[PDB]
Amino acid sequence: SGNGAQGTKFRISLGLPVGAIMNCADNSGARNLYIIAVKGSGSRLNRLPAASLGDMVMATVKKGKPELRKKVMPAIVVRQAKSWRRRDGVFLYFEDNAGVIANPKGEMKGSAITGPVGKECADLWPRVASNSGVVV
């Protein structure tokens, strides 16, 4: 998370290290996002900074609009597809990896999200749940 996130997030299973190519599910024009950094990672030797649902990552657009390529931008993960664990006992995971484009302040760049977003991201970022469809 970092600065600008409302509330804390319980730790779930990390599934997205640096170098992962997720999808981009909105009307911003970007097709995929390439993870180069994770906000709030550890400084331990020989650990790739891994991400999860609701984490704020730095992404680079590889496929999509040419205006969005060759630049660094923040991103918020909305689908993880790694089997994490909630406290009530369910082991749930999405089908693919996905994220949205965002500013360093936390506001959304797009207007809609064409896929499902889990409640660990919809309760941590209020602007994602305002443009999402069905939760979980």
């Binding site: 082991f91 995971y93 999405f94 069905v134």
Partner: protein, 49 residues
């Protein structure tokens, strides 16, 4: 305490066990164990098992 039904077979999923799976068009499936989650990914017909 709420017991959900299995999406593939139809058994009783108890709180604590079971693996949930959500499809890309946001349809929620609830599997009992690593058996029905494996046979779902192989495109098996539950009316033939």
């Amino acid at each position: 305490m709420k017991v959900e039904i299995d999406s593939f077979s139809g058994a009783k999923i108890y709180p604590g066990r079971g693996t949930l799976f959500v499809r890309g068009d946001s349809k929620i499936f609830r599997f009992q164990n690593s058996k029905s989650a494996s046979l779902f990914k192989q495109r098996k017909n539950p009316r033939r098992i």
